[PDB]
Symmetry: C3
């Protein structure tokens, strides 16, 4: 059984410092998280920082909360060959994919990827991983296989002389495998790399910076530069990224919503019928209430920038931005999260006949009328307490 | 491991009395049920009775065993607007869907629905819910979220001041959300509704009574008014409702068979290759035997009207109606349950060469011939002990 | 949590002797197996041997390691009628499907099948069953329902007067069901069959020997008679059977690879991104190393003919054939296993820019060049330590 009676606004509980940044991890064993099988990681990469390449047993979505850079993501079968022009040697490699604030990047399970910060500000990445994903056939525990360096696996840690995938093989095998000498093998194994997972790129590394499954986009910007499907001039907005807008989501079975609430703005009571909703606050704070099937409050408090609130499938919720407004990115454990509103223009209340509402709430048709047609706005409610 | 060595003909174990009827619930923790993750609920709604609207984390099939009425089922994205004519006010609401005895209604997970009895007899509904359904991402425990009233959640109970989804929110939020006053908020919360989940509709509530996912039918009658795919003039019949006959079943991944056996009639030994079969007896009684992979009898006894026998996937079974005949509705945990017969015109025995049967049963070709061609009937066997 | 820190080269742990052969079973509770929910069974059928028909709750793949014969597999809905000509009686039965060494046979869950050895050598069958398959709705435990004989269920045993599915029913029921007498019923129940599951076919049984779901092939030969997609003239080869080559695999969600390594040949380091890989050695021996996400060696030793090594999804692996060469059949828990190579012409290393490799391994572009372009071969590496 899932323990969903006391949800908590969670902060990271673990941290790993690297040469060029640091990684924060939320508590995988938190009750809500464990039920949904979700993990949350936040990477802070300083300028010229390189998150070494690795792959994991679970699909991931990564929201770029701040900064911009380039990524490299192989994706099997799609040997994407590219030749980096002269200045007369030409290197052959994967496409160099740039990304910026507001981008929702996708990383399928088993696919290695690396990210580099090419901006002046710190690159802040919100990594959502779902272990109860069809793609993961092991167990509900997150594992990340690094190709280089020597990271102190904290994604799940031990929940240890932990290294990269090559440090576990015999010197010989790697010599034959790559056709090299022990001198290189030791560099490969990185027995002495004390930089952890985010490294400082040296003086040269820069020639790259200037830059049907195989044709699918692997990102979508749901930030302020794009249009939001749900928009309230005086209340705020919510931008969606699902398989309808980003085909690849159909394969990872995940999606996201990026919300923005104006001061004192409120998101109408609603619940998601087909998925869990893992909300990470990117700015501001808000009062949030969640109710369960027993009609009990399972959360009633504040959520502040940097915190995560896991809202279980079908649990009813209400959000109210504070004075500083409230902004977030909500990851969904389905390729197409559907939210049902309780009140508003298109809602459950609106669908019900007045005769039904009357008998339901022991009120009169008139009151039933005021009840179902009182709120005229939609998902986002403009300040009007 | 599943404990499937001692199946039992189960009766409801819990009951909740309401103003206009009562709800009975089977034991979710029963060994067979727990293995299959099934729940069984029976609602008895008296004339003018209204089962308040609610939604659950699991998909449901509802067999109308007796009576007739109307239902309202929203289904997200499908804002189905309808205007109830004048008599000069016109109300806007969901389609009013009527149903009658023999109807197999569908209720996808996360969708709220309500039912009203408009007949003179009591409305009896057999509700089958499957918690191990892809649509449920929480846990194997049934949860029903009511929009009104104050039901004492018995679907799973506590397995408590339990109320509807609004009673868990702060008065303010609901005032702003619906644009109303505390006076209405308290009516909404129903802190004082002692009627439970099935309520008496007052003097007026009646104007309704006269009545591509969005286009799919949400019901199919598998009663006596329709034709049965399997029919034995002297034995009985079985009517199927699968995704081939009701497209929506493909989405809930459930199906049903409604059987009718004449006095002393027998259903040939068979097993379902791809699903569990949850049988609810609607009338009569029968002797039933079930055998497992160890060739052991895991059930050998009677099943009487009102009882439920959970037959696990692949377990072999034989049914024999008593003198009063035997009638039932069997819910399947797959959108297309396939049954393999052991003997008869199209059976496993028929498929096997005589040479194979001989060596198999240590008998002669002649006997092997009598063995595989002896029974000429099909799934249903006419009285011929 | 899955215990994947100490993988073992496993040998069968249980055995059941039959009249015409014997059955060996691996340890279902082995840690790796339990994680992946796999079972391994090896049948050795002597000439004129008949493995009695039965069906199980899990899908199976069967590699014919030695010998040849005929099989009969019904598959529901597909009442495939055939009439065995005269010599004036004509028998009606299922298609008689022949098979030979190198064949990868498929057996969907719930489908009964029987196999007969018509060769002079012993028929050796490697049976891979996956209990964590969508098709199995019971529990992670393998169950096989036999239609005849009296097998001492060892697939999982008790993990018992175990018989065939008919021995669990009352004599009467079976008399009516098949329209026969107690004399035949007892033959059916086989209360006295001491032959177990593999029986000697008597003097006569031979007339058979000469021989859109319903149209799908149920086998594919991945032996030496066919072409291998991956081929290294001096190293060896690997032949694949996935849903692209055998459509039916899409339904069972399983696939296989048959590998052949020449003396001292090595399979390049790689991992499967989307499935577990259950390797059964058919000949020779090899040194194998497996590394996990902690960069730790979870296996480092030999695998010899007759042994099974379960390689978990995403775990990195290297194989090196001994002097006698190494040969195997690797079952996949996905209809399309994808392997990513770490080094070679099409690899992760090749995809990465030189600038990335440099900073990654703390080496210079030149060395990075030697690292990523050093190995020119592919999945299979020709002897070149
Ligand atoms: Cl929201
Ligand atoms: Cl039946
Ligand atoms: Cl391999």
């Amino acid at each position: 059984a899932c323990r969903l009676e006391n949800l908590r606004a969670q902060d990271p509980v673990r941290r790993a410092e690297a040469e060029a940044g640091f990684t924060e991890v939320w508590d995988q064993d938190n009750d809500e998280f464990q039920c949904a099988g979700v993990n949350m990681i936040r990477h802070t990469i300083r300028p010229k920082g390189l998150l070494l390449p690795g792959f994991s047993n679970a699909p991931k979505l990564i929201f770029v909360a701040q900064g911009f850079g380039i990524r490299g993501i192989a994706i099997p079968g799609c040997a994407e060959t590219y030749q980096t022009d002269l200045r007369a040697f030409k290197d052959q490699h994967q496409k160099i994919r740039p990304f910026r604030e507001g981008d929702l990047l996708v990383v399928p399970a088993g696919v290695s990827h690396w990210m580099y910060n090419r901006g002046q500000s710190d690159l802040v990445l919100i990594v959502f991983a779902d272990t109860r994903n069809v793609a993961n056939q092991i167990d509900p525990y997150l594992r990340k296989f690094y190709l280089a360096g020597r990271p102190e696996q904290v994604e799940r840690g031990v929940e240890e002389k932990s290294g990269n995938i090559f440090s576990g093989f015999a010197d010989e095998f790697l010599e034959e495998a790559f056709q090299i000498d022990g001198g290189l093998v030791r560099k490969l194994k990185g027995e002495d790399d004390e930089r952890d997972r985010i490294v400082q790129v040296d003086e040269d590394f820069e020639v790259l910076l200037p830059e049907t499954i195989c044709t699918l986009r692997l990102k979508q910007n749901i930030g302020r530069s794009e249009r939001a499907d749900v928009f309230n001039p005086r209340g705020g907005r919510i931008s969606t990224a699902n398989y309808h807008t980003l085909p690849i989501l159909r394969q990872v079975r995940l999606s996201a919503e990026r919300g923005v609430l104006y001061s004192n703005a409120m998101v109408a009571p609603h619940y998601t019928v087909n998925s869990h909703s893992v909300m990470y606050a990117t700015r501001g704070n808000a009062r949030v209430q969640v109710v369960d099937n027993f009609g009990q409050s399972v959360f009633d408090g504040e959520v502040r920038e940097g915190q995560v609130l896991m809202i279980p499938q079908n649990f009813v919720v209400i959000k109210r931005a504070s004075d500083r407004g409230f902004e977030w990115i909500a990851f969904k454990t389905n390729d197409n999260a559907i939210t049902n509103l309780l009140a508003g223009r298109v809602s459950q209340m609106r669908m019900l006949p007045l005769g039904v509402l009357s008998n339901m709430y022991r009120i009169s048709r008139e009151e039933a009328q005021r009840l179902k047609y009182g709120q005229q706005e939609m998902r986002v409610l403009s300040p009007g307490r």
